[PDB]
Design a protein around this motif. Structure first.
Motif: not given
Length: 330
Positions: A196-205
């Motif tokens: 279990e970990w924590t991603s720092t965010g996302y982008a779409v396209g």
């Protein structure tokens, strides 16, 4: 010591991956689904209810000179997708890609649910989450990795899953030729028994990156990427005609679409999932409605970085005293 084994998609959609595993003496080779989201090594066997076997290769402990009944031990597991299996337990010699563990708990299925029966390509599971999740009673058993760890050159394994292609599981070493750039490591919580970990965010396209903490698990045994409803809605809003269908069980989109990529953060690094990885094809044969590879985790209770995400990366499962996860592009 080290091991290295090729892992192969079971079908044209990459629904799961199978890796050959040698069990017993002489070896009985079974094709197992390596699952970093569970902690039981279980197999179809000579003990499995006959009507529940349909094409799988079975383990027959009576034909292995190194098999021993683990007296009194039973197991029973239920997975997130509603499938299940149960049975009794042997210890035997298990080898993966040249790495051998003696005295491994091999959980022999007496019963499996329909989803397992119906998948002739998967002969069992090999769990690679933390041993605290192992279901054997009354004496909990260790995973293959936990048993191998002390003997390994480095206390790690890596997952390098292919998109519509074979890939590799390595034990005990990091293949520096298998990725590009650098590996970014990130903290792991073992409190729930998962990676279990924590991603720092996302982008779409080609959109701007949204910095936001997304706690989830690295799970090779889950096909899709399950994320919060907000994130998933933002993704599918960029696909004309996409919608969430309660009748189908998630987001669907027109098969004529070109899907955007999806980026997730690992610390200051970024892993890009190409749009094609998010296409799971017609919902039924011949349909022009296609099933999405990014789905909401709402009501699962946890976000899951399944194969859709992991196959875009070279992933290090670092089982040192303080475990961590590493991700590199490839």
């Amino acid at each position: 010591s080290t091991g290295s084994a090729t892992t192969t998609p079971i079908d044209s959609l990459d629904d799961a991956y199978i890796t050959p595993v040698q069990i017993g003496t002489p070896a009985q080779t079974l094709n197992l689904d390596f699952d970093t989201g569970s902690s039981d090594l279980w197999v179809f066997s000579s003990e499995t209810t006959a009507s529940e076997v349909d094409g799988q290769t079975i383990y027959t402990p009576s034909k292995s000179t190194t098999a021993k009944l683990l007296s009194g031990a039973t197991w029973s597991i239920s997975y997130g997708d509603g499938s299940s299996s149960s049975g009794d337990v042997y210890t035997d010699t298990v080898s993966v890609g040249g790495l051998t563990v003696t005295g491994q708990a091999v959980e022999s299925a007496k019963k499996v649910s329909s989803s397992f029966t119906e998948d002739s390509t998967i002969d069992g599971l090999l769990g690679l989450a933390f041993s605290t999740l192992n279901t054997v009673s009354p004496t909990q058993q260790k995973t293959f990795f936990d048993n191998a760890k002390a003997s390994l050159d480095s206390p790690v394994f890596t997952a390098d899953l292919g998109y519509h292609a074979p890939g590799t599981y390595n034990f005990g070493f990091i293949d520096t030729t298998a990725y590009t750039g650098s590996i970014t490591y990130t903290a792991v919580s073992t409190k729930q028994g998962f990676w279990e970990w924590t991603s720092t965010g996302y982008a779409v396209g080609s959109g701007t990156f949204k910095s936001t903490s997304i706690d989830g698990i690295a799970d090779t045994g889950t096909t899709l990427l399950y994320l919060p409803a907000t994130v998933v809605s933002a993704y599918w809003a960029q696909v004309s005609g996409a919608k969430s269908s309660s009748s189908v069980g998630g987001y669907v989109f027109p098969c004529s679409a070109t899907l955007p990529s999806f980026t997730f953060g690992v610390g200051s690094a970024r892993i890009v999932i190409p749009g094609d990885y998010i296409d799971f094809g017609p919902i039924s044969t011949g349909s022009s409605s296609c099933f999405g590879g990014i789905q909401s985790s709402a009501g699962i209770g946890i976000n899951i970085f399944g194969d859709v995400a992991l196959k875009a990366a070279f992933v290090v499962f670092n089982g040192a005293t303080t475990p961590t996860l590493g991700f590199a592009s490839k």
